């Protein structure tokens, strides 16, 4: 699962191929349905596809992404750093759906839970700008 | 019974937000009750959610299957002469064509459903959404 | 064929001025021809037009996807060694950054394209425009 998740992350963020990464996360989630990384990054794929493909640009894709984050919060709450990650992911979900009010709330939640990421200062300034 | 089984399937799709669990609960209802409008209409809803949420479901075949389930629903509703259920099928058609960005056809089914007396508290929200997509 | 399909997609975006129709058409070309530079470059143009014309598309994710399509285009162009197509992708980058008001980065890509021998009849109009925003 560790190697399979690494190959899927590389497809989404390095290769910048969300359709390939989506398939890879679906396969992981077939075997491991409560895997937080697969649930969190499948939502990331769906958010990228919504904003990059006509056939994916529908409320159903965004609803599915939010529901995957909801399922991850359930599992994470059921790991303080992992419970912090989902909150940062909820922030990325709303910074993209233009709701900066809700995004600021999740950004604070993630930071207060001790979420560490080298992109956090770049996100703070972007959130400060919007 | 079918009433309870339909309630469990609706809860799987809209409350639990698990369209794969709901889809097969609806298949089971359609095995015993092939002409059940709720099972036909909401199996198509499952397929629409799966299309937009799973790679292996993101295919024209999935959307074609959803349309064919709505086709079967219109046949049943029209066969009975249930104006109420015909309006509902026509509204579900509008929703299908709205999500596949065919706003021209969706507007036609929206008018059909409204003219058949379809009542839904979400109709003003849909009316404004369709007016925004159709004004561009 | 791909040549006719690309022509219909270009007409949908620039003549018909329907970027959502053109987007679908470019996605279809990219399904069969993933490394087609014209489909890659103009799918990014669609996404750029949608960003600036639709509330539901006005997101950083849309601009990120457009930039990533231009990135994929530079990979393909550089993979072949096509100086012409490398120059074109750099001009397309200048437009991307010019439109998102990052004139510092746009000036860099405009020079890169001109130095790669990019030929376009609109270059003096752009040269005069970029000089106004950068002055």
Residue numbers in the entry:
A (entry chain A): 3 to 80, 83 to 134
B (entry chain B): 2 to 137
C (entry chain C): 2 to 136
Q: Would you copy out the relevant sentences from the publication that reported this structure?
A:
Sgt1 is an essential conserved cochaperone of the molecular chaperone Hsp90. The N-terminal domain of Sgt1 is predicted to have a helical TPR fold (Tetratrico-Peptide Repeat) and is responsible for the interaction with Skp1. Skp1 has an N-terminal BTB/POZ domain31 that interacts with Cullin1, a structural subunit of the SCF complexes that arranges the substrate and ligase subunits in close proximity, and a C-terminal extension of around 35 residues, that folds around the helices of F-box motifs.
Crystals were obtained that diffracted to 2.8 Å of a complex comprising Sgt1TPR and a truncated construct of Skp1, Skp1BTB∆. The Skp1BTB∆ construct comprises the N-terminal BTB/POZ domain in which an unconserved loop that is predicted to be unstructured (residues 36–64) is replaced by an alanine-serine linker. The asymmetric unit contains 3 copies of Sgt1TPR (chains A, B & C) and a single copy of Skp1BTB∆. The Sgt1 TPR domain comprises 3 TPR motifs, each of two antiparallel helices (A & B), and a solvating helix (κ). Skp1 sits within the upper half of the concave face generated by the Sgt1 TPR motif repeats. Residues from the α2-helix and β3-strand of Skp1BTB∆ form the interface with residues from Sgt1 TPR1A, 2 A, 3 A and the capping helix. In this interface the α2-helix of Skp1BTB∆is amphipathic and forms a bipartite interface with Sgt1 in which half is hydrophobic, and half is electrostatic. A pivotal interaction in this interface is a salt-bridge between Sgt1-Arg93 and Skp1-Asp35, and our structure-guided mutagenesis experiments using full-length proteins show that mutation of Arg93 alone is sufficient to prevent Skp1 binding in vitro and cause loss of viability in vivo. The three copies of Sgt1TPR in the asymmetric unit form two identical dimeric interfaces (between C-A and A-B) with an rmsd of 1.46 Å in an all-atom superposition. The yeast specific insertion between TPR2A and 2B of both protomers contributes the majority of the interactions of this interface.
